[PDB]
Amino acid sequence: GNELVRRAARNLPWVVTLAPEGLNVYDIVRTERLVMDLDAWEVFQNRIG
Amino acid sequence: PVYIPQPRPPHPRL
Amino acid sequence: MKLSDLRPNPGANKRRKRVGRGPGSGHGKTATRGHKGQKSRSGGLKDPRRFEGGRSTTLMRLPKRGMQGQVPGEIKRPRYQGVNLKDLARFEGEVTPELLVRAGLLKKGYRLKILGEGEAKPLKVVAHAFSKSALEKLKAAGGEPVLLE
Amino acid sequence: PKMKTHKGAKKRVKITASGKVVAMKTGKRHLNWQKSGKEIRQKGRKFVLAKPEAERIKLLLPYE
Amino acid sequence: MRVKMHVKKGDTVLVASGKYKGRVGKVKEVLPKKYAVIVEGVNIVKKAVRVSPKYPQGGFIEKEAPLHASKVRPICPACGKPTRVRKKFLENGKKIRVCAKCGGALD
RNA sequence: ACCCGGUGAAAUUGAACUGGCCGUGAAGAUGCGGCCUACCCGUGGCAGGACGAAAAGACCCCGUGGAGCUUUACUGCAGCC
RNA sequence: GGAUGACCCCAGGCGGUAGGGGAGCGUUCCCGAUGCCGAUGAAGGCCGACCCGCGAGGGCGGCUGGAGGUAAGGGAAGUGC
RNA sequence: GCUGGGGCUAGGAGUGAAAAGCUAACCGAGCCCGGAGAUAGCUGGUUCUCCCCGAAAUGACUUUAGGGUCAGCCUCAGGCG
RNA sequence: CUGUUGGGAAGCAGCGCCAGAGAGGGUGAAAGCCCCGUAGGCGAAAGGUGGGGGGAUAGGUGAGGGUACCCGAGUACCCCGUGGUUCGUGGAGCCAUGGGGGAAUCUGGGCGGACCACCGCCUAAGGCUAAGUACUCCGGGUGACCGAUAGCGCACCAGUACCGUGAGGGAAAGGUGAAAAGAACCCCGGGAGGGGAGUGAAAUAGAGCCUGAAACCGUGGGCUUACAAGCAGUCACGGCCCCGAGGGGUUGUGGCGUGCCUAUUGAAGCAUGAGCCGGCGACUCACGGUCGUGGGCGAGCUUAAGCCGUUGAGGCGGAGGCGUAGGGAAACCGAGUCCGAACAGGGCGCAGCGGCCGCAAAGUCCGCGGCCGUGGACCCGAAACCGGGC
RNA sequence: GGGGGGAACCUGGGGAACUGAAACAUCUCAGUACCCAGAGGAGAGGAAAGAGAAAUCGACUCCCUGAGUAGCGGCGAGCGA
Numbered sequence A: 001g002n003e004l005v006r007r008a009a010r011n012l013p014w015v016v017t018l019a020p021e022g023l024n025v026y027d028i029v030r031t032e033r034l035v036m037d038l039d040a041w042e043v044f045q046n047r048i049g
Numbered sequence B: 001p002v003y004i005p006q007p008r009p010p011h012p013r014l
Numbered sequence C: 001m002k003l004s005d006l007r008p009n010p011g012a013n014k015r016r017k018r019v020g021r022g023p024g025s026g027h028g029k030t031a032t033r034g035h036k037g038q039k040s041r042s043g044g045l046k047d048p049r050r051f052e053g054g055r056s057t058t059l060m061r062l063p064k065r066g067m068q069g070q071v072p073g074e075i076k077r078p079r080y081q082g083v084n085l086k087d088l089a090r091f092e093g094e095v096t097p098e099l100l101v102r103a104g105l106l107k108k109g110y111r112l113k114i115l116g117e118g119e120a121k122p123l124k125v126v127a128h129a130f131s132k133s134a135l136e137k138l139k140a141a142g143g144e145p146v147l148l149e
Numbered sequence D: 001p002k003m004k005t006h007k008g009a010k011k012r013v014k015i016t017a018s019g020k021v022v023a024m025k026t027g028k029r030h031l032n033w034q035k036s037g038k039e040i041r042q043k044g045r046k047f048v049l050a051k052p053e054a055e056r057i058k059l060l061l062p063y064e
Numbered sequence E: 001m002r003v004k005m006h007v008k009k010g011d012t013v014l015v016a017s018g019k020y021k022g023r024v025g026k027v028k029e030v031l032p033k034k035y036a037v038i039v040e041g042v043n044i045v046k047k048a049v050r051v052s053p054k055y056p057q058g059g060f061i062e063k064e065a066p067l068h069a070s071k072v073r074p075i076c077p078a079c080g081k082p083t084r085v086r087k088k089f090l091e092n093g094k095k096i097r098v099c100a101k102c103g104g105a106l107d
Numbered sequence F: 001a002c003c004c005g006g007u008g009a010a011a012u013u014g015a016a017c018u019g020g021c022c023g024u025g026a027a028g029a030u031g032c033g034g035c036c037u038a039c040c041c042g043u044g045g046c047a048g049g050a051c052g053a054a055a056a057g058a059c060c061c062c063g064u065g066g067a068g069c070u071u072u073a074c075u076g077c078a079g080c081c
Numbered sequence G: 001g002g003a004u005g006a007c008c009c010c011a012g013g014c015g016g017u018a019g020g021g022g023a024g025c026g027u028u029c030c031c032g033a034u035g036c037c038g039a040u041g042a043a044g045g046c047c048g049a050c051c052c053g054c055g056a057g058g059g060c061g062g063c064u065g066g067a068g069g070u071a072a073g074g075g076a077a078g079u080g081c
Numbered sequence H: 001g002c003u004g005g006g007g008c009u010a011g012g013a014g015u016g017a018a019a020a021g022c023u024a025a026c027c028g029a030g031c032c033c034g035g036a037g038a039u040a041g042c043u044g045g046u047u048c049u050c051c052c053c054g055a056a057a058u059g060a061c062u063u064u065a066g067g068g069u070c071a072g073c074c075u076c077a078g079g080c081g
Numbered sequence I: 001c002u003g004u005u006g007g008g009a010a011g012c013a014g015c016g017c018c019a020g021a022g023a024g025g026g027u028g029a030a031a032g033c034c035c036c037g038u039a040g041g042c043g044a045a046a047g048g049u050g051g052g053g054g055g056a057u058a059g060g061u062g063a064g065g066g067u068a069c070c071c072g073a074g075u076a077c078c079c080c081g082u083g084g085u086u087c088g089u090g091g092a093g094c095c096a097u098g099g100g101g102g103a104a105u106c107u108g109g110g111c112g113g114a115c116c117a118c119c120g121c122c123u124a125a126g127g128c129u130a131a132g133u134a135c136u137c138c139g140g141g142u143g144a145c146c147g148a149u150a151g152c153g154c155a156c157c158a159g160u161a162c163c164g165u166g167a168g169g170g171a172a173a174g175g176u177g178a179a180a181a182g183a184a185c186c187c188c189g190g191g192a193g194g195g196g197a198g199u200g201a202a203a204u205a206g207a208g209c210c211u212g213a214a215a216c217c218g219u220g221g222g223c224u225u226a227c228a229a230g231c232a233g234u235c236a237c238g239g240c241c242c243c244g245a246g247g248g249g250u251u252g253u254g255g256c257g258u259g260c261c262u263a264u265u266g267a268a269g270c271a272u273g274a275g276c277c278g279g280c281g282a283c284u285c286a287c288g289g290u291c292g293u294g295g296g297c298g299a300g301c302u303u304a305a306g307c308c309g310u311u312g313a314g315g316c317g318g319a320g321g322c323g324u325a326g327g328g329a330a331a332c333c334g335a336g337u338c339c340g341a342a343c344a345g346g347g348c349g350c351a352g353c354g355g356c357c358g359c360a361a362a363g364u365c366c367g368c369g370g371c372c373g374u375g376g377a378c379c380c381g382a383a384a385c386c387g388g389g390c
Numbered sequence J: 001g002g003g004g005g006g007a008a009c010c011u012g013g014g015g016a017a018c019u020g021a022a023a024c025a026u027c028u029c030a031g032u033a034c035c036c037a038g039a040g041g042a043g044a045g046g047a048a049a050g051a052g053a054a055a056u057c058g059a060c061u062c063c064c065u066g067a068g069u070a071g072c073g074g075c076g077a078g079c080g081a
């Protein structure tokens, strides 16, 4: 959810930036490994309840 | 081409 | 699991049938249509559900029956939908119509009528009508019907 | 556009619970004076259309 | 509105690419519409001239061919390096081109 | 018209290495059979065949096609009473 | 047979129009792709008596060409004369 | 009588010493654009490859007869055996 | 930034650096850092806008009690003729109104499907009213959109050339090269064209210009043919030429041999179509249905329009739909119901596999496929009909 | 102040036929095509002499749904709140 962190990471060829409200499977599968906030893991856990 | 000359009539096979 | 690995199960995405694309296909030339009829033409036949080639059709030679209605249309009257006891087996305490819409058992705008199929439970059952059977089963089992109106 | 119901069908036919198509016997609208009792009696009943015709009519009743 | 010339007539530029990469010379002329510049003594080409007045005996003449204006980097009149141009705002409100490596002005 | 110099079309055209008879064949064959005949390629001529060319037969029938016309065919409208 | 296409063995079927059904080839485009092939030569062209495939096709090699092309695995159609 | 110039009358309408003549090189109803991709139970055409199966030209009914509906006959899937 | 191949570096190599900027386009080939950009910011004297923020103005506003003054006239209302509505004369109301007749002012009038009563709803015969809706000449963004026979008719000086009296019809035609360095000068020639010289990485890239297929025309060479019968090939063997116990080209003799497509009972057929080559060219889509199939969930399944977010991120939304009960014309009853007097008969209906947990399934949602209905619905083709113009 | 123009869109005044009903006339196509008037950046509509059964709702417009339901119909083809 942190705007500053997605700002810092956006431009790298190997990083796909995403907010938690945005987590889709295509982006998860497009990428090799997944990295999440504890704050964002809370939203993912909420949306699959 | 734009204009067709009419064809001859047939022989009357009547 | 990467994109190169994502795959529909065998048989989920069938290929289409393409007519008119050559002799090897077995579907070329006449495009699986036969030779030379109304049905081969673009536009085809009349409604093959009704039309019988000009003769009186097997539907139209059957007699009508009952009131079909007339202008100005439907007559508004109380409409009843039934719910058997075996459907109520999932509830405890009370049952009402408003509660059975949320279960998906009773449509909206219909009045509640309990029917006899099943086993009654000691329940409070509020409804616009009861069966001769549902009433007997319900009493004999400790439940409480409440005919509302 | 969505199919329309054939209204001639809805006025002559009913679709039973298993999908049989049921209609009134034909033949006693008139000319009944010299008919049997066995004849009018039996023609007061319904009957089950033959399978190939029933399935045609069921396609005309898309929302029953 | 205008074609963006990062380089003007008269300033010394370095040719950064092509058969003449490394050369240094003054911008003789800027042709905006073609996005090109002529650099002194760079892109020499032979041109056939018909026997005529002004060219009796005819033959050929040495001519300086146009260079894509992207193949050209100005040499800083202070630090002497080639450089990109920045825009510095004077207190006057005017704006000058200024070298990036050091900080000098290139006018 | 013909020959020489100059300029140079056309319909048509599955491809062709395109003969006669007697048969055969969807019933009138250069193309199949059996014979007979026949070296290769042109030029001027004739019109028997290539079921020659041209025109998706006018006749005829067919289509629950069309149009003009008619009347004590049907049903309307104008007009008139 | 071994153990549910992992290859082997024995037996049988395999003329085909309308038509049913199955399995595949290739064309354009998308994801794979901020990748990978590419001036030590892309696509397209022209050859080939070579290799793989029953086939549709795919390779590979030489010439031409001079700047593009695009895998395995999938997705969509203005898809084969 | 013929003729120049200037004008008027048109589409189910004009004009016609009457031929259904003529109304811009085809008039039993002008031309253009539009409805419009009218409708055509008719004719024509319908494009890669391989593998398995493989019809019918009948019956009944039909302003039907070279078109259809149902059945018969082909094919695929699932079931019974 | 440097080196290296190269006509050319952005390719490759070595060492770095920026990134809220690695969207994209250029530059001699393939560049985050060369150029134009991009992210992120900034910006109007003048004109236009200003639905937002503020101010002003217009404007607006009580009770009882009496009185019965006003409350939209050729109108309501009835009848005749019609239109509108789902309503085609129907039991035909309602709204509208061409013709006739023709009121009342709230104890007035209209409506709730002829009509009457009752219970109700509403106040006709004056006007105005933003927003949410439609469209795309116009500007911008973006495509599992086209790529010069495509995409608009027009990438190009096209609604032009040209055709038509006119209304109207209506094309074709893009590309040298990185850079004109677009070939001085000489030779043949009237010119055109060429041969040299010169430019270029490349000149069968030379402007009649990228690539440059096919039909088609020619020059050169290998084999071959003037006693021979032919859907033109195929099988065999032999000769000659080429390439290196084999292969390629050719074809002399022998054998066999009725083009392709279409239509047909039946075609080589003397039945149709086609000169030949290149390119264009015909079963689709949307919504609904019906089977089948791949999944999700399962007495349940599923959202629509919208709302929020994103800027190729998804979520919310349960209104509604299908299913959970059938039978009957219906009232109605209900695991039953309908006919019937019937406790009669008959029609149409009613009832998973293991070990409380697991597999499965009614059903439903989505994807895919075949087929069906509605649309032009596989593509091309009438003769005609109709409207408005010329 | 008007007049004239503007690609579509809007409202009003008029208003076809092919076609479909496998013929055809009522019906369909369709108040569509088109002609005319007017308007504007939108137009129309709009503040109940409403709806229609709720002892209810509260202007109009637009979208979803209700619903191919109610009904309409040579009770045909179809049309459709």
Ligand SMILES: [Mg+2]
Binding pocket: A010, A011, A012
């Ligand atoms: Mg990024």
Ligand SMILES: [Mg+2]
Binding pocket: A010, A011, A012, A013, A014, A015, A016, A017
């Ligand atoms: Mg990134």
Ligand SMILES: [Mg+2]
Binding pocket: A013, A014, A015
């Ligand atoms: Mg990535």
Ligand SMILES: [Mg+2]
Binding pocket: B005, B006, B007, F054
């Ligand atoms: Mg002729």
Ligand SMILES: [Mg+2]
Binding pocket: C013, C014, C015, C016
């Ligand atoms: Mg598919």
Ligand SMILES: [Mg+2]
Binding pocket: C015, C016, C017
């Ligand atoms: Mg298939």
Ligand SMILES: [Mg+2]
Binding pocket: C018
């Ligand atoms: Mg295909």
Ligand SMILES: [Mg+2]
Binding pocket: C021, C022, C023, C024, C025, C026, C028, H048
């Ligand atoms: Mg084929």
Ligand SMILES: [Mg+2]
Binding pocket: C026, C027, G019
């Ligand atoms: Mg077949």
Ligand SMILES: [Mg+2]
Binding pocket: C030, C033, C036, C040, C041
């Ligand atoms: Mg066909």
Ligand SMILES: [Mg+2]
Binding pocket: C032, C033
């Ligand atoms: Mg078919």
Ligand SMILES: [Mg+2]
Binding pocket: C030, C033, C034, C035, C036, C037, C040
């Ligand atoms: Mg056919």
Ligand SMILES: [Mg+2]
Binding pocket: C035, C036
């Ligand atoms: Mg046939």
Ligand SMILES: [Mg+2]
Binding pocket: C034, C035, C036
């Ligand atoms: Mg046939």
Ligand SMILES: [Mg+2]
Binding pocket: none
């Ligand atoms: Mg055919």
Ligand SMILES: [Mg+2]
Binding pocket: C035, C036, H066
């Ligand atoms: Mg036939």
